[PDB]
User: What shape does this take?
Amino acid sequence: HHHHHENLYFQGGSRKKIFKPEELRQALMPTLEALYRQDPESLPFRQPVDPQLLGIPDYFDIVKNPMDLSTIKRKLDTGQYQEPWQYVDDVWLMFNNAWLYNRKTSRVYKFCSKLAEVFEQEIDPVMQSLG
Ligand SMILES: COc1ccc2c(c1)c(C(=O)Nc1cc(C(=O)O)cc(-c3cnn(C)c3)c1F)cn2C(C)=O
Assistant: This one.
């Protein structure tokens, strides 16, 4: 959760601007696209986890707030984010759920780490420009 330390405007205080959905798409969709471009690493993250399909019925005992790339895409596509930090926190939620649910020595854990590396590189300059 180190990103809470930077861009303190998103952490708290009074409203200084209204982000329009188009503004957020233009700034943020490229960072999401960067994750989708990771093949094979994005494949476990392009749809919500389906416990019955994947044989992991305990999934929702562990992960209370599921998230995935397609949901994040949809929220950007339909204007459901009011501010950029909400998008960033959903990306981190997706990664944190995967790292929580999966052992370190499983494929999905490894793929999560790769995607997290890619995201950090793409997002940092973007969030500076929006803060
Ligand atoms: C069996 O144990 C687990 C445990 C956690 C998993 C997954 C599996 C997982 C996953 O396998 N997602 C997934 C889902 C689907 C789907 O159709 O819903 C498809 C793939 C997939 C697509 N192509 N490939 C090679 C794999 C895919 F990787 C995604 N997970 C997450 C994000 O935690």
The chain has one domain: 1-131.
